[PDB]
Write a protein that binds this ligand. Structure first.
Ligand SMILES: OC[C@H]1O[C@H](O[C@H]2[C@H](O)[C@@H](O)[C@H](OCCCCCCC3CCCCC3)O[C@@H]2CO)[C@H](O)[C@@H](O)[C@@H]1O
Length: 265
């Protein structure tokens, strides 16, 4: 594979869409690769990591408990609820809801959690509180995945998302246990985690959260690194491309291949 930046460019050429990408050292925040890093892209389900970061903040403050069991109704369910639809009779704990939202892509679990933090407005306020003055959530699942051209709703920028993720995972804004919990949820992703490992060379660490929307919108926020270490944050978003999901997945994997082959930068 070619250099990272050259591969990213080839991806836009082949997809006819915009690609947004940031490669950042997790420990220090050093930005290695930045492409359309200040441009807006729909977050799609990747917003779920920020969501649970807000939940953990409430837990740290004593305003929430991951153990708290929430009982919900069938009418509360939205499209794609693989875990939540199985607990209409017994409910789910707040912690279980975050695990379902992040590791299984459960949309109803996400909406239930979003309510607890003040909805889209409440989460956006949380982002402003941690210094992210760009990212914004305006809608709920699944409407937030609409990805209309020129629509600023439910968007982030590669730079903002990378910085925010780093803040949640390492800045001590969240307690030690909470930072460890958020990290483990990403490590446990069952939607794309296993698939990615199946194609990663031995020795490479992966933790992630993916998303998919309309008009080709696709994205992934992850931790990646050799020697089984979460060395860098890699954020890649795609938008406005008519390409098949397979090819969009292939292009993102291709950018990853370029990083892997040319890691020392
Ligand atoms: O010399 C480097 C490596 O070259 C290949 O590895 C290939 C691998 O066979 C392929 O499956 C993958 O595709 C990409 C797999 C990663 C896809 C997800 C990447 C994510 C990471 C988080 C942010 C978004 C992208 O590319 C690599 C690099 O050429 C060899 O198989 C391996 O023995 C060797 O160590």
């Amino acid at each position: 594979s070619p250099q990272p930046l050259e591969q990213i460019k080839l991806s836009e050429s082949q997809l006819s869409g915009r690609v947004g990408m940031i490669e950042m050292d997790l420990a220090s925040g050093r930005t290695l690769t930045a492409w359309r890093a200040d441009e807006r892209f729909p977050m799609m389900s990747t917003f779920k990591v920020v969501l649970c970061g807000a939940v953990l903040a409430r837990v740290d403050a004593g305003d929430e408990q991951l153990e708290r069991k929430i009982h919900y109704r069938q009418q509360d369910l939205v499209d794609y609820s693989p875990v939540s639809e199985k607990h209409l009779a017994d409910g789910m704990t707040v912690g279980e809801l975050c695990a379902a939202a992040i590791t299984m892509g459960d949309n109803s679990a996400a909406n239930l959690l979003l309510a607890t933090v003040g909805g889209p407005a409440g989460l956006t306020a949380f982002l402003r509180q941690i210094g992210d003055n760009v990212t914004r959530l305006d809608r709920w699942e699944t409407e937030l995945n609409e990805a209309l051209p020129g629509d600023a709703r439910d968007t982030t920028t590669p730079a903002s998302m990378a910085a925010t993720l780093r803040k949640l995972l390492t800045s001590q804004r969240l307690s030690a246990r909470s930072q460890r919990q958020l990290l483990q949820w990403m490590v446990d992703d069952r939607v794309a985690g296993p698939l990615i490992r199946s194609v990663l060379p031995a020795g490479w660490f992966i933790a992630d959260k993916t998303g998919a929307g309309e008009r080709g919108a696709r994205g992934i926020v992850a931790l990646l690194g050799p020697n089984n270490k979460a060395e860098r944050i890699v954020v890649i978003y795609l938008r406005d491309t008519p390409a098949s999901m397979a090819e969009r997945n292939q292009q993102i994997a291709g950018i990853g291949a370029a990083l892997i082959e040319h890691w020392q930068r």
